[PDB]
Amino acid sequence: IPMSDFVVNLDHGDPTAYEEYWRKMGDRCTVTIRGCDLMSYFSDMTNLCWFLEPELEDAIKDLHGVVGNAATEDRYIVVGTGSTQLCQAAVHALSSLARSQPVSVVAAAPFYSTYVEETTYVRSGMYKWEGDAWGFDKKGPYIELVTSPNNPDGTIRETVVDEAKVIHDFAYYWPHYTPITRRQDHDIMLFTFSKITGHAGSRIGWALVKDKEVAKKMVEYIIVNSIGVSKESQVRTAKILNVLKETCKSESESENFFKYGREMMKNRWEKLREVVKESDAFTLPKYPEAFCNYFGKSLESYPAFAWLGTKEETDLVSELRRHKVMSRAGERCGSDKKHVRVSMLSREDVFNVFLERLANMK
Amino acid sequence: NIPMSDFVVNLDHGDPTAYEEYWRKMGDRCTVTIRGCDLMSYFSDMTNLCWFLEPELEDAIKDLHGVVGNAATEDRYIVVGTGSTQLCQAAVHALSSLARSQPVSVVAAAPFYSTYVEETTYVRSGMYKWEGDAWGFDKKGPYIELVTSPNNPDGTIRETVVNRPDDDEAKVIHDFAYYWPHYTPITRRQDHDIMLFTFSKITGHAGSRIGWALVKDKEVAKKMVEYIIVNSIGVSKESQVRTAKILNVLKETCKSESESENFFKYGREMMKNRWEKLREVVKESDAFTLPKYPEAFCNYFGKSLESYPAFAWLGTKEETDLVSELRRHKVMSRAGERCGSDKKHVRVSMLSREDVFNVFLERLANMKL
Numbered sequence: 001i002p003m004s005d006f007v008v009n010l011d012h013g014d015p016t017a018y019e020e021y022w023r024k025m026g027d028r029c030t031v032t033i034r035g036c037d038l039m040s041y042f043s044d045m046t047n048l049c050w051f052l053e054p055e056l057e058d059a060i061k062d063l064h065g066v067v068g069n070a071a072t073e074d075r076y077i078v079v080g081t082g083s084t085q086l087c088q089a090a091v092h093a094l095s096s097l098a099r100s101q102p103v104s105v106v107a108a109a110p111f112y113s114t115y116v117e118e119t120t121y122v123r124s125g126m127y128k129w130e131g132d133a134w135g136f137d138k139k140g141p142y143i144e145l146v147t148s149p150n151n152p153d154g155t156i157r158e159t160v161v162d163e164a165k166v167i168h169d170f171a172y173y174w175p176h177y178t179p180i181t182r183r184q185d186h187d188i189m190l191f192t193f194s195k196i197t198g199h200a201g202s203r204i205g206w207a208l209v210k211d212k213e214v215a216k217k218m219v220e221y222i223i224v225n226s227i228g229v230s231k232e233s234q235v236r237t238a239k240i241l242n243v244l245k246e247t248c249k250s251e252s253e254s255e256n257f258f259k260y261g262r263e264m265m266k267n268r269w270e271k272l273r274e275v276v277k278e279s280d281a282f283t284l285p286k287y288p289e290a291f292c293n294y295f296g297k298s299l300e301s302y303p304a305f306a307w308l309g310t311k312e313e314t315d316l317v318s319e320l321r322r323h324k325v326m327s328r329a330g331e332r333c334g335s336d337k338k339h340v341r342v343s344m345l346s347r348e349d350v351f352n353v354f355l356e357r358l359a360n361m362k
Numbered sequence: 363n364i365p366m367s368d369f370v371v372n373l374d375h376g377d378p379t380a381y382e383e384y385w386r387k388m389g390d391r392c393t394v395t396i397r398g399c400d401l402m403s404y405f406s407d408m409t410n411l412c413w414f415l416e417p418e419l420e421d422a423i424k425d426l427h428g429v430v431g432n433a434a435t436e437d438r439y440i441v442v443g444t445g446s447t448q449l450c451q452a453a454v455h456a457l458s459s460l461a462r463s464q465p466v467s468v469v470a471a472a473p474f475y476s477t478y479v480e481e482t483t484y485v486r487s488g489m490y491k492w493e494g495d496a497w498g499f500d501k502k503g504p505y506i507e508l509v510t511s512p513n514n515p516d517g518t519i520r521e522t523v524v525n526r527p528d529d530d531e532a533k534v535i536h537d538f539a540y541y542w543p544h545y546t547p548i549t550r551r552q553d554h555d556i557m558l559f560t561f562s563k564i565t566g567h568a569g570s571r572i573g574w575a576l577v578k579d580k581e582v583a584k585k586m587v588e589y590i591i592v593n594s595i596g597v598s599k600e601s602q603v604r605t606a607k608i609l610n611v612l613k614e615t616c617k618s619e620s621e622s623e624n625f626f627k628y629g630r631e632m633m634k635n636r637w638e639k640l641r642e643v644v645k646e647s648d649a650f651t652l653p654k655y656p657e658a659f660c661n662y663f664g665k666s667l668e669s670y671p672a673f674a675w676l677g678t679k680e681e682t683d684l685v686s687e688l689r690r691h692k693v694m695s696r697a698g699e700r701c702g703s704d705k706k707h708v709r710v711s712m713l714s715r716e717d718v719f720n721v722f723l724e725r726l727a728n729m730k731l
């Protein structure tokens with residue numbers, strides 16, 4: 001079997017890039033759970049989010065503290081089974097408190113394809129996905145989704161359209177990906193564990209929510225949806241997240257996660273960048289340089305996804321399938337046939353194989 | 363310093379803390395160890411229809427049913443979900459999806475599991491409508507029937523009740539969350555189209571958030587899976603690995619003839635002890651009723667024996683709101699009106715800690731007196 005017939009799967013952003021890193025960290029990352037632990041449905045009935053584990057709460061807030069990307073004071077924390085359940089909890093919670101329904105849900109194009117799935121699959125009478133925000137005019141209550149750094153195109157975003165409301169999805173707003181220009185302080189701020197460290201099968205995200213009443217409804221949603229979130233997932237995320245925090249007080253460019261992650265993304269993007277340059281069809285986006293409060297230097301953005309473009313009237317997702325490279329169709333993301341989103345967080349060898357095949361075609 | 367007369371006894375939720383002592387005394391053999399680089403990927407197994415299902419856990423489920431003998435696992439799919447809670451919704455969603463017209467009606471024989479009302483109501487879906495009590499139901503069209511046996515709240519063994527053909531557009535979901543030897547005799551190896559189980563209610567590990575569905579129709583199975591994908595991109599990996607570990611111990615325990623090692627013996631002995639106690643109180647009390655449960659032959663234990671369900675369905679001949687009366691004694695339970703019954707019953711959980719159970723018995727004897 002040649003590495004011409006091997007399918008390189010860069011459609012999903014399964015973040016496996018980070019595995020060797022975590023392997024190396026050895027015995028301190030380990031989580032030990034005994035037969036009788038984590039048995040109860042409840043964590044703490046004193047918290048608005050009663051199914052959130054204290055060690056995890058502390059870890060989340062400590063971590064936004066050391067990095068300085070989001071405000072965690074005077075606001076409620078809600079955990080979900082990935083940020084996926086969290087964005088839907090928020091949409092359901094904000095829809096519940098709107099004067100009237102359906103509430104229009106929009107996001108600037110190109111947007112995170114999954115959003116169209118999340119807002120469409122249960123055929124709920126509470127909210128209606130209304131496509132691109134730029135092209136959104138419609139009256140009545142709406143919710144805007146703002147992914148920054150964006151998915152697919154990695155751009156830094158702000159809103160674009162008075163009681164209607166907004167959700168900020170800052171899943172990729174970490175120092176290894178983009179500079180920390182500012183400590184965010186918005187009404188609803190969504191984060192995901194999978195994207196910081198690569199632990200995607202842990203299924204953990206969190207929401208920082210200012211409005212007390214929105215936090216309450218997100219919670220109710222989750223309780224009816226899954227009665228909360230895996231305790232052991234939460235205890236594990238805590239340990240890894242704590243280790244990541246101890247890692248920040250290190251000079252080692254192989255211990256310090258954010259200086260490990262960032263170098264890797266730089267190395268990966270500089271490589272992809274050669275390939276694209278010495279090629280006649282392709283186009284990557286241009287990323288402004290910006291000062292980083294965390295790193296204390298002025299540096300470039302290296303997004304988890306490459307928005308791969310074509311200048312010629314090709315149907316770019318299909319061409320890549322033909323060379324055994326799965327990508328995410330641009331049409332899926334409110335773009336056009338000339339664009340693909342390719343994951344930049346795969347393993348070394350897969351990424352290389354991907355570059356190799358990107359060179360070896362017309 | 364707070365008198366025990368101020369202690370609230372919460373028998374409303376069914377938090378199964380009864381089983382902690384047992385798992386503690388099992389010690390290290392139960393421990394689960396997970397290293398920094400484990401379980402990182404979204405995917406478990408791209409071969410399986412449910413690609414987010416950990417093989418260690420598929421094996422455990424299949425093994426456990428193999429041994430207990432309560433459900434058929436052959437020639438069908440296994441869909442893991444975050445609790446049985448996510449799985450029933452996935453099922454109603456899947457069967458509705460595959461229906462000739464929507465909304466599909468969703469009914470359940472009363473008394474029924476209250477949380478069903480919220481689960482098929484909270485997102486105001488176009489695909490299905492909650493139609494309440496299945497008894498005498500004949501709204502013409504596609505319908506799903508929920509059959510929970512042993513039932514919640516009343517412990518009853520159940521079969522479908524709306525049994526018009528409505529041909530092939532009559533669908534059924536079986537919730538066998540309490541069909542285990544420590545609660546009820548295993549009279550038949552269940553072989554229905556959709557069978558749900560929850561890890562919570564076997565061993566008490568409720569915060570693990572683990573249930574599974576045994577699904578015959580692939581088209582339904584694939585739809586449950588797609589619902590879970592969008593809903594939550596699968597189920598916590600470490601939850602799955604930890605559920606498999608303890609399930610496996612549970613299984614090892616089954617050959618043990620020690621009354622205190624063997625889960626189902628211990629489990630059963632605990633339930634019995636508690637129902638005997640509660641039954642004494644209701645007997646000597648003046649105003650209380652309790653359901654009668656037939657004796658039946660258990661294929662697992664090989665003996666004819668009683669059910670001791672996880673919930674007590676407490677009633678009153680008297681004309682009072684029983685949920686209110688218990689509320690005045692700092693005993694919380696689940697309103698019978700919430701389960702499609704009347705003010706004269708409430709559901710109380712038999713699965714609390716030993717001390718809490720006892721304070722409730724103490725209080726129960728002191729009632730109306």
Ligand SMILES: Cc1ncc(COP(=O)(O)O)c(CN)c1O
Nearest residue numbers: 082083084112151171192194205
């Ligand atoms: C914009 C965006 N939102 C959310 C998700 C992550 O959701 P989860 O943590 O539920 O996997 C991703 C990919 N990890 C994403 O790119």
Ligand SMILES: Cc1ncc(COP(=O)(O)O)c(CN)c1O
Nearest residue numbers: 227445446447514539560562573
């Ligand atoms: C009938 C019934 N079904 C399902 C649930 C189990 O749900 P979960 O998977 O959320 O523990 C329960 C609570 N044990 C129940 O009583």
